[PDB]
Amino acid sequence: MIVSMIAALANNRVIGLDNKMPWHLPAELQLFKRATLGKPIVMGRNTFESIGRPLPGRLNIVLSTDYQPEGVTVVATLEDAVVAAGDVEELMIIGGATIYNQCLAAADRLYLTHIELTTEGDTWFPDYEQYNWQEIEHESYAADDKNPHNYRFSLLERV
């Protein structure tokens, strides 16, 4: 099975400020939807509670005993996530920061929406530049009426 991580990042890896993403870019959710639909998604407790429900069309897996949200798979490790996902090609790690940090070393792919934006931050996507990657693909998007920034989607594969 391929282990992938998916995130939206400003310049220099910023992903959070004061416990939220500090930008408007509704397009990221479209890209997120396309990249994740029909796949297992793996997320931290905080991330699941932020979303406030399991996402339809995906196997929702939460990393975390008594924690028993209705109809959601809970596991304690990434390896456990892989076992619970079964015989599929790819598992999608959707955050948050702690999960990203812990799983980077096991990631085959990164699905990154680079938002062209310099922002204050207190939380970063892990420094993946410490490893070697090829870009399988990219898509560049112009800012528009709803998305005030330019952004580029990139799929990196580990080498």
97 is in an annotated binding site: yes
65 carries a ligand binding annotation: no
CATH code of the region 1-159: 3.40.430.10
Q: Residues 147, 62, 28, CA angle at the centre, nearest 5°?
A: 10
Q: H/E/C letters for each residue in the chain? A: CEEEEEEEECHHHEEEECCECCCCCCHHHHHHHHHHCCCEEEEEHHHHHHHCCCCCCCEEEEECCCCCCCCCEEECCHHHHHHHHCCCCEEEECCCHHHHHHHHHHCCEEEEEEECCCCCCCEECCCHHHCCEEEEEEEEECCCCCCCCCEEEEEEEEC
Has 154 been labeled as part of a binding site? Answer: no
Query: Is the bond preceding residue 96 a cis peptide, omega within 30 degrees?
Result: yes
Dist CA 62 CA 76 (whole Å): 8
The residue whose two tokens read 């490893």 is 131
15 is in an annotated binding site: yes
Say whether 92 counts as a known binding-site residue. no
Q: Is 33 annotated as a binding residue?
A: no
99 is in an annotated binding site: yes
What residue ranges do the domains of the chain occupy?
1-159
Query: Token pair 């990139």 is at which residue?
Result: 154
CA pair distance 48, 46, nearest whole angstrom: 6
Spatial CA neighbour of 63 closest among 20, 28, 26, 106: 106
Asked whether 157 and 136 are in contact (CB, 8 A), the reply is yes
Q: In whole angstroms, what is the distance from residue 112 CA to residue 17 CA? A: 18
Query: What resolution, expressed in A, was reported for this entry?
Result: 2.1
Say whether 50 counts as a known binding-site residue. no
Phi, then psi, of 94 in degrees rounded to 5 = -105, 15
Q: Which two tokens stand for residue 12?
A: 């220099």
Say if residue 52 carries a ligand binding annotation: no
140 labeled binding residue = no
- Residue 43 annotated as binding? no
User: Backbone phi, then psi, for 13, in 5-degree steps?
Assistant: 80, 5
**Cross-strand pairs, 137:** 155
Can you tell me the distance from the alpha carbon of 4 to that of 33, in angstroms, rounded to the nearest whole number? 15
What is the C-alpha separation between 43 and 37, in angstroms, rounded? 15
How was this structure obtained?
Answer: X-ray
